[PDB]
Amino acid sequence: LCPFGEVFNATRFASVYAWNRKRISNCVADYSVLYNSASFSTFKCYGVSPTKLNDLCFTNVYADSFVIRGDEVRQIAPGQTGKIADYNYKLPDDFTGCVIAWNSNNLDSKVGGNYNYLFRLFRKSNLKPFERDISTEIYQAGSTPCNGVEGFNCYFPLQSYGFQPTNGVGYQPYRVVVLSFELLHAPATVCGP
Amino acid sequence: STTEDLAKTFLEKFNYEAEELSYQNSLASWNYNTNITDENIQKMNIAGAKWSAFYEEESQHAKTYPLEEIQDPIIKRQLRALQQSGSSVLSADKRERLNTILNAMSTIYSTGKACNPNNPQECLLLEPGLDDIMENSKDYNERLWAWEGWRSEVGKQLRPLYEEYVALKNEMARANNYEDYGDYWRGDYEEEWADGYNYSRNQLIEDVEHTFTQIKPLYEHLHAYVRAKLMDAYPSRISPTGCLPAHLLGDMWGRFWTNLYPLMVPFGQKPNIDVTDAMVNQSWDARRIFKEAEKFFVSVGLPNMTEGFWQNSMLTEPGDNRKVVCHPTAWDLGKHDFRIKMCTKVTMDDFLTAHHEMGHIQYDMAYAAQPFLLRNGANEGFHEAVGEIMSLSAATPNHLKNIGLLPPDFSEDSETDINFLLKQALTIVGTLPFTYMLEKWRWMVFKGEIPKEQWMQKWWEMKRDIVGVVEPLPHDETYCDPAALFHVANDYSFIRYYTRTIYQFQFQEALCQIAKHEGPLYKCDISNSREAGQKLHEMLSLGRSKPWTFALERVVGAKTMDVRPLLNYFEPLFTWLKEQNRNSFVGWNTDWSPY
Ligand SMILES: *[C@@H]1O[C@H](CO)[C@@H](O[C@@H]2O[C@H](CO)[C@@H](O)[C@H](O)[C@H]2NC(C)=O)[C@H](O)[C@H]1NC(C)=O
Ligand SMILES: [Zn+2]
Numbered sequence: 073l074c075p076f077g078e079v080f081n082a083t084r085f086a087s088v089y090a091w092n093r094k095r096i097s098n099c100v101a102d103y104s105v106l107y108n109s110a111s112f113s114t115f116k117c118y119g120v121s122p123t124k125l126n127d128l129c130f131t132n133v134y135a136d137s138f139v140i141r142g143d144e145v146r147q148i149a150p151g152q153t154g155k156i157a158d159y160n161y162k163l164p165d166d167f168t169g170c171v172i173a174w175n176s177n178n179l180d181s182k183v184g185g186n187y188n189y190l191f192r193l194f195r196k197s198n199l200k201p202f203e204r205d206i207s208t209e210i211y212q213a214g215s216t217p218c219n220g221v222e223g224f225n226c227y228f229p230l231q232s233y234g235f236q237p238t239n240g241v242g243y244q245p246y247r248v249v250v251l252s253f254e255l256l257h258a259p260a261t262v263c264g265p
Numbered sequence: 266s267t268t269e270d271l272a273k274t275f276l277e278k279f280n281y282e283a284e285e286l287s288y289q290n291s292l293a294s295w296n297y298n299t300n301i302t303d304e305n306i307q308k309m310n311i312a313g314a315k316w317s318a319f320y321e322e323e324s325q326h327a328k329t330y331p332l333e334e335i336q337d338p339i340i341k342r343q344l345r346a347l348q349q350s351g352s353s354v355l356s357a358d359k360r361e362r363l364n365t366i367l368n369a370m371s372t373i374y375s376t377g378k379a380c381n382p383n384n385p386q387e388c389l390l391l392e393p394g395l396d397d398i399m400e401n402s403k404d405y406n407e408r409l410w411a412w413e414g415w416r417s418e419v420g421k422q423l424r425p426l427y428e429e430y431v432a433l434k435n436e437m438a439r440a441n442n443y444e445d446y447g448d449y450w451r452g453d454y455e456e457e458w459a460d461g462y463n464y465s466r467n468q469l470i471e472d473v474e475h476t477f478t479q480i481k482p483l484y485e486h487l488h489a490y491v492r493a494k495l496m497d498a499y500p501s502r503i504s505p506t507g508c509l510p511a512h513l514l515g516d517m518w519g520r521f522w523t524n525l526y527p528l529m530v531p532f533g534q535k536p537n538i539d540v541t542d543a544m545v546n547q548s549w550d551a552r553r554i555f556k557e558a559e560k561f562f563v564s565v566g567l568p569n570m571t572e573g574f575w576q577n578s579m580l581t582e583p584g585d586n587r588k589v590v591c592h593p594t595a596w597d598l599g600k601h602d603f604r605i606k607m608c609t610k611v612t613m614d615d616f617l618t619a620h621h622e623m624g625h626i627q628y629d630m631a632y633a634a635q636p637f638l639l640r641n642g643a644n645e646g647f648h649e650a651v652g653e654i655m656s657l658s659a660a661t662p663n664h665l666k667n668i669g670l671l672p673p674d675f676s677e678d679s680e681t682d683i684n685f686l687l688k689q690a691l692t693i694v695g696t697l698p699f700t701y702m703l704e705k706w707r708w709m710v711f712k713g714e715i716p717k718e719q720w721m722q723k724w725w726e727m728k729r730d731i732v733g734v735v736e737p738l739p740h741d742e743t744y745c746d747p748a749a750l751f752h753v754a755n756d757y758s759f760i761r762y763y764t765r766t767i768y769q770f771q772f773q774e775a776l777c778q779i780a781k782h783e784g785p786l787y788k789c790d791i792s793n794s795r796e797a798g799q800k801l802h803e804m805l806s807l808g809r810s811k812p813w814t815f816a817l818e819r820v821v822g823a824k825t826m827d828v829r830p831l832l833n834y835f836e837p838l839f840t841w842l843k844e845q846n847r848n849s850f851v852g853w854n855t856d857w858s859p860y
Binding site for chain 1: 270
């Protein structure tokens with residue numbers, strides 16, 4: 073059937089700067105199962121109705137997946153500002169889709185700490201929507217060159233999370249899946265009645 | 266690129282690294298206090314030494330940016346907390362000698378013992394053996410050898426070590442553009458870069474001296490009532506017009522007058538209020554105590570506890586092979602992790618202690634959205650003052666009838682209110698001349714007004730004049746009597762216990778007017794009043810973003826401290842004291858001595 077079981081029930085999830093994108097086509101999806109799952113903490117669809125919404129032949133669907141903190145879920149929205157919104161992941165002002173997130177504290181936390189997820193802290197400028205940038209340069213703050221060393225006004229432009237199971241609710245891991253219903257001229261085989 | 270953008274980029278890197286590194290230090294100290302073994306102390310001292318070496322490397326990074334080129338109040342309050350340095354300005358041979366002197370004074374105090382005259386096989390330590398004599402005995406000659414022997418064996422060994430500690434501390438202060446080490450300690454109350462809310466280090470001396478002269482009529486009527494009741498317990502030993510001997514105050518030093526209550530009770534037939542037996546008959550446990558404290562804060566408008574509070578706290582003794590220190594503390598580990606560790610018993614004293622410790626948690630949950638360097642109270646007296654007023658309303662008899670611990674046909678007695686007010690005055694009023702005299706002697710000795718050949722001469726001149734306490738035996742220039750206290754020998758300041766009492770009654774008098782209370786102030790109960798909970802929450806969520814003169818005006822409506830709310834609380838007691846003192850003498854003279 074649809075590859076929705078390979079997206080939501082995957083054992084590995086990516087980081088927020090090197091995030092993943094998957095194309096889903098040639099299947100019929102049962103969207104009513106996802107609506108009445110009663111397991112997701114947030115379910116906010118933009119542009120489309122919160123109704124049954126089954127018999128709609130969309131052009132293409134993308135599945136993006138990453139792990140962030142629980143105090144940054146409000147930044148995954150159009151017209152928002154922050155560290156995640158400016159440097160890592162950006163949504164346009166005309167977005168048609170839905171944002172699904174749920175707690176994953178029992179899967180992504182260890183006694184001692186988990187340090188396998190990264191985010192970018194310093195950057196010169198912002199980025200366009202749907203833009204991915206991977207780099208390992210040296211961020212120069214002042215005018216004195218660094219020449220690949222960390223001294224004064226020289227910083228390494230990456231930062232890692234630290235996840236423990238005894239943290240507060242705002243510091244716990246959250247697993248985020250974003251679905252985009254792009255509209256384009258196509259036969260539009262993905263209907264799912 | 267200006268220098269303000271260089272100091273702003275520096276603080277966005279410091280916040281993410283100091284938060285993750287201070288959490289590993291706090292988590293490694295929780296596992297030792299709840300499980301005392303040999304392997305836990307090794308992991309405690311390793312993670313506690315990485316935080317001290319990381320912090321001093323960035324204290325030299327912060328001084329690359331001059332403080333006079335920043336025009337932002339948020340940034341400048343964070344840079345001055347990171348640009349401060351201590352003993353790093355000295356040389357290597359001077360800094361190594363300073364830590365040798367400090368460690369040697371702390372081992373004499375914790376391992377010193379005084380032996381018993383006329384029985385030389387009995388030598389007793391301070392905490393298990395010497396505190397029981399001074400707090401429970403009624404013999405005149407038993408309390409005398411336990412008072413002299415502590416100061417002639419322990420205090421005369423710190424005298425040559427304390428003089429070299431003064432000279433090394435006065436060399437560190439003069440290299441940081443201060444005038445002496447006393448001026449160094451008074452900088453905690455200094456406020457700057459404000460328009461109309463400024464405060465100076467010289468202004469603190471004028472504020473303490475002004476408020477002390479207004480409590481002197483109240484302290485004289487309490488001094489006369491104690492002296493006339495101590496002449497029955499120790500007959501033919503106290504002069505009717507004079508001072509009080511130092512070894513008969515119910516304590517080793519005389520800091521509190523609490524243990525003298527059974528020798529002076531106004532109405533000896535009316536009992537006190539004690540609800541420790543109705544809790545046993547209704548089958549109350551340790552979880553019932555902490556659930557009643559949570560319903561108190563909900564009725565005033567404050568939130569509930571989190572889910573991890575009930576799973577990670579230690580509310581009872583484990584009863585296993587583990588060894589746990591039983592001391593009530595509230596822990597803020599960081600990353601929104603709140604715990605309480607105490608060993609709870611079903612009494613009335615543990616009922617009121619749960620309201621005090623939960624008041625510290627409500628303060629910590631309010632400023633959680635502040636930056637990492639600005640998560641504290643307004644100064645060093647604000648944090649304990651919030652917890653004291655929460656335990657003041659829960660002991661009122663109006664509140665105890667509403668929770669079923671008293672029968673509905675309970676009649677208020679006017680003779681049991683005198684009993685409640687005298688016991689409060691022995692703890693609160695009786696310790697205020699003691700704290701004023703301690704800090705005034707240390708400020709002069711750091712400045713040079715008192716030469717080293719006149720140290721003990723000025724110590725007993727201010728006891729007779731300010732406090733009214735006379736020495737039992739004469740001393741000379743080989744003693745060090747202030748060095749027998751815990752805070753002096755461990756390098757702690759003592760002025761935080763004076764200003765905390767004055768702030769306590771200013772908050773209580775203001776909140777009982779919003780609640781439309783009718784009657785005297787000692788019967789006030791702020792429960793089921795949501796208007797009084799919104800006023801207190803506006804001050805608790807500020808942190809250290811604003812000066813402490815700004816945060817005081819949001820609650821009481823004034824910039825500086827005032828002592829007139831404190832004199833209104835003890836106004837029924839003040840009328841009863843003057844009627845009892847109609848055939849006595851108020852005052853003392855400094856010519857009588859026991860020797
Ligand atoms: C209290 O501390 C002791 C030692 O500090 C802990 O004993 C260790 O437990 C771990 C895990 O079970 C073992 O791998 C070690 O070999 C034990 N060490 C020793 C010396 O026995 C003990 O587990 C701690 N108690 C609790 C409840 O965690
Ligand atoms: Zn406290």
